């Protein structure tokens, strides 16, 4: 409640001088330019229906001097008419602007002119002369058949497109690329339109031969668009094919991956495993290229937000999915771990592919033992032969949800006598780059820490404050995710977990941290199936409350 | 100059205006040190859209499949300056394509140099040069008593810039070269790289002896990948870093998913038990705790019986079945995998429900009946 006309009359003849350029796109620049504008075109539309259904017509004279000129040019105009439910809108619009008593002949020549246009839109003829003659002979009214014949008109292309695929290098007729170029332009209005499905599909197939592109990324990013909101469902090598061949497409996927975990949907990784699994990213990347530049990204994100644990979460999702859609397609014929993540040791690698799932869960401490081992040998001994240096042995790590997150949740139950492995490797995750010196400051103070909390278990159930003492700095983190650790895994916990969460929950901040951290830890359990009933109900009941608070 | 009375001048300096109405040029142009006869006639008026241009045969044979190419420039060039460009343009193109016609040497150092330095050499490591000198392959010997070659591609000044090195072993080959540095110097330095993989090789000669190494036979020295079979229809792929070979490699099962599992549970199980002072072979038996067996069929080893264009056994039902009518390449294919490929080759011909068309991999008549 600030404007009214003002901004709606700008962009009126903003696009009333737009139309008059545009007026039936029957060349190719009336057509980009309709194809790209029209989005806009459409709100502009919602905000104009929204003015006419609220008053009422021939009586006011707002935009009325020319707006049957505006729509008279929107609807001869077909690469409009072909946009999701501008067609239903614009109808709308003259619903208004129809008069039921038509007293003044002005208003009445309205009606006559807007049935006359919707005669136009609806029931005109402006198709071939033959089959018009044929099928009102046959008693056939256009309606009927348009379907079938709509279908038949794309499979002859569909089919002929495939063919001009087929014939790499035969002395035959070269489908001319202007053809193609055409449709692509009449796919992107009626990407929504379920009757084109296959024509979309054999253009994002059949590429061939040419140095150049051919296709223009006005169809790129609508087919983007509607794949990601799932508006048309394609099959799988179609989309694949098209992220090979428009790369600000991939990355445009991507970033429609990353609002889901920052905006909306913060902590729901059961929806981030749908998201993941109905995009066919994890698949897409089974594709030595667009893993890359999906990883890429990834790090782009790790360094901005210096290690956002929610991040780190959707990543050892993305890996997790991936795995397990590169093992499936991938008997004969796949690329080796050098080639997917070149920057370390095949060797790591080859060890945390192996899941945890199919593994003792007394066998977990050993492996871990030994990943840490060898993680010193890969980052300390920074020789020729090894890593760039820490930080790719690091992002090794993080894509393996399970290993990371296991360490602590082990330290607690070997407590008594911590491993040394196991401190360094801890301090690795929560503090790489660091400096030997500080490495080992970081490892005696959580050592103190244990024998702390080790002697505070074996107590009884106790106050919250003796446990902030110890909390009481750079290694905050580190601490508060092991005693969160502590509070779920120890017996004791349930009863004096609210009094520690209020201390530590000083900001918004933490509190989104330690959400992340349960729905993590929650996802983690319950795919690897592994429990106390206690820690599960107590946790859920804590993110529960915690998620009104933030 | 802008005016093409000076920078023609400047950039075609052999190409004299016979005619006062300079209509008629005659003369020579230049390219690449070689200087080449040229007779470009105008009409009455300075337009290109008709003009004569003949050569000598020499230049035509060198123009070879660019006739119509240049016929065009002729229709679509503005100035004659800027068709003189593009033709020079042109030449440089055709003769940097022919290299391998296009040679006077500088003897008196070329040839002689390299009798000088191979005998620095030693007269034993040559094996090959081809007869233009242009490549000459040596021959080296590992410690291990192993055979490695290296190609040199040579240039016309050898001395002054960098022969091209050539050389099997699977890490990248650096060469320092100085144009003081010669033959023996690249010589060290290979024997260095040699020597620096020697570990690599044991472990591969280990491999390639006491197993059933399938999928590279006579396998290169350039290989890191070793499909072993064990017991009988499972396969496990070991591909192993050169530097570190002795390191667990990545290796991962092909066979019957039944007999796969437990495997992969017991390497899982097992991989910590690696260790880098026994071969990969002393640890791969001990972690998985079996044996392979050697050579379990050494002549029917696996005939990959696989598609040939798609690598896979059933494509939709499809079986490798379509055959070579051949006895030297015998590759199944697939009925849509041949058709998709044989109809977007120019060679092949179509009759009514039959195609004839080459073999892929052997470029021999093959028909296929849809
Ligand atoms: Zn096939
Ligand atoms: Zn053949």
Redesign the pocket.
């Known amino acids: 409640m600030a404007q009214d006309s003002v901004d709606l009359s700008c962009d009126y003849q903003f696009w009333m001088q737009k139309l008059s350029v545009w007026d039936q796109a029957s060349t190719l620049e009336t057509q980009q330019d309709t194809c790209l504008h029209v989005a806009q075109f459409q709100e502009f539309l919602r905000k104009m229906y929204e003015a006419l259904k609220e008053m009422d017509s021939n009586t006011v004279i707002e935009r009325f001097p020319t707006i049957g000129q505006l729509l008279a040019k929107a609807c001869w105009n077909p690469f409009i008419l072909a946009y999701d439910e501008s067609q239903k809108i614009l109808i709308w619009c003259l619903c208004c602007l129809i008069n039921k008593e038509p007293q003044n002949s002005g208003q009445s020549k309205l009606n006559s002119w807007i049935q006359g246009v919707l005669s136009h839109i609806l029931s005109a003829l402006r198709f071939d002369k033959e089959v018009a003659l044929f099928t009102q002979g046959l008693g056939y009214a256009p309606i009927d058949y348009y379907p079938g014949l709509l279908k038949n008109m794309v499979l002859s292309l569909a089919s002929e497109l495939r063919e001009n695929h087929l014939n790499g290098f035969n002395t035959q007729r070269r489908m001319a690329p202007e053809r193609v170029a055409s449709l692509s332009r009449v796919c992107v209005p009626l990407i929504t339109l379920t009757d084109v499905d296959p024509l979309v599909e054999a253009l994002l197939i059949c590429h061939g031969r040419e140095p150049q592109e051919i296709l223009q990324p006005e169809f790129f990013e609508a087919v983007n668009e509607a794949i990601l909101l799932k508006k048309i469902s394609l099959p799988m090598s179609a989309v694949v094919c098209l992220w090979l061949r428009h790369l600000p497409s991939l990355e445009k996927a991507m970033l429609h991956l990353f609002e889901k975990l920052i905006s909306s949907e913060r902590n729901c990784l059961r929806r981030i495993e749908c998201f993941i699994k109905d995009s066919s990213l994890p698949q897409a990347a089974c594709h030595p290229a667009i893993f890359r530049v999906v990883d890429e990204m990834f790090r782009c994100a790790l360094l901005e937000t210096d290690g956002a644990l929610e991040i780190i979460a959707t990543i050892q999702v993305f890996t997790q999915c991936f795995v397990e859609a590169l093992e499936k397609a991938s008997k004969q014929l796949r690329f080796a771990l050098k080639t997917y993540f070149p920057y370390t040791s095949p060797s790591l690698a080859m060890v945390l592919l192996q899941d945890p799932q199919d593994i003792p869960r007394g066998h977990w401490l050993q492996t871990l033992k030994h990943i840490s081992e060898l993680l010193r040998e890969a980052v300390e001994d920074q020789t020729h032969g090894s890593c760039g240096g820490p930080f790719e042995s690091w992002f090794l790590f993080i894509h393996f949800g399970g290993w990371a997150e296991m360490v602590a949740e082990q330290l607690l139950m070997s407590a008594a006598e911590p491993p040394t492995a196991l401190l360094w490797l801890l301090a690795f995750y929560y503090g790489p780059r660091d400096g030997r010196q500080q490495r080992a400051q970081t490892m005696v103070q959580v050592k103190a820490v244990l024998g702390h909390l080790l002697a505070m278990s074996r107590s009884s159930s106790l106050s919250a404050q003796d446990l902030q003492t110890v909390a009481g700095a750079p290694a905050q983190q580190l601490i508060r995710h092991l005693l969160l650790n502590f509070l779920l895994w120890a017996p004791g916990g349930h009863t004096i977990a609210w009094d520690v969460i209020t201390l530590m929950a000083h900001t918004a901040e933490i509190t989104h941290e330690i959400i992340g951290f349960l729905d993590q830890t929650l996802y983690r359990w319950n795919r690897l199936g592994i429990e106390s009933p206690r820690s599960e109900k107590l946790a859920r009941e804590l993110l529960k409350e915690l998620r009104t608070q933030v | 100059m802008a005016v093409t009375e000076a920078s023609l001048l400047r950039q075609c300096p052999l190409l004299l205006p016979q005619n006062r109405s300079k209509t008629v040029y005659e003369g020579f142009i230049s390219a690449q040190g070689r200087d080449f006869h040229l007779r470009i006639v105008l009409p009455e008026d300075l337009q290109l859209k008709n003009a004569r241009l003949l050569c000598s045969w020499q230049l035509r044979t060198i123009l070879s499949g660019y006739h119509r190419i240049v016929q065009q420039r002729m229709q679509h060039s503005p100035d004659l300056m800027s068709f003189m460009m593009e033709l020079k343009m042109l030449l440089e193109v055709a003769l940097k394509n022919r290299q391998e016609l296009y040679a006077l040497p500088p003897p008196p150092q070329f040839y002689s140099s390299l009798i000088e330095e191979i005998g620095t050499l030693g007269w034993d490591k040559l094996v090959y040069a081809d007869t233009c000198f242009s490549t000459i392959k040596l021959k080296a010997e590992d410690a291990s008593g192993r055979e490695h070659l290296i190609t040199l591609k040579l240039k016309a000044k050898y001395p002054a810039e960098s022969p091209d090195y050539f050389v099997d072993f699977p890490v990248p080959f650096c060469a320092s070269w100085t144009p003081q540095s010669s033959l023996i110097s690249i010589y060290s330095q290979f024997l260095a790289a040699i020597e620096s993989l020697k570990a690599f090789w044991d472990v591969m000669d280990e491999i390639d002896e006491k197993t059933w190494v399938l999928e590279p036979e006579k396998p290169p020295r350039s290989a890191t990948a070793r499909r072993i079979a064990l017991g009988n229809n499972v396969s496990i792929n070991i591909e192993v870093d050169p530097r570190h070979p002795t390191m667990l490699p990545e290796c991962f099962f092909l066979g019957a998913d039944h007999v796969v599992k437990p495997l992969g549970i017991k390497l899982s199980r097992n991989i910590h038990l690696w260790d880098p002072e026994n071969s990969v072979l002393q640890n791969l038996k001990d972690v998985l705790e079996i044996d392979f067996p050697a050579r379990a069929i050494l002549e029917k080893s696996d005939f990959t019986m696989d598609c040939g264009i798609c690598y896979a056994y059933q494509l939709d039902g499809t079986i490798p079945d379509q055959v070579?009518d051949?006895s030297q390449?015998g590759?199944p294919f697939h009925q849509i995998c041949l058709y998709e490929w044989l109809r977007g080759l120019l060679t092949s011909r179509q009759s009514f429900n039959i195609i004839f068309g080459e073999?892929?991999?052997?470029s021999?008549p093959?028909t296929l009946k849809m």
């Not at chain 2, 073999?359 to 052997?362: Q, T």
């Open positions: 070579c051949n390449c590759q073999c892929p991999y052997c021999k093959i």
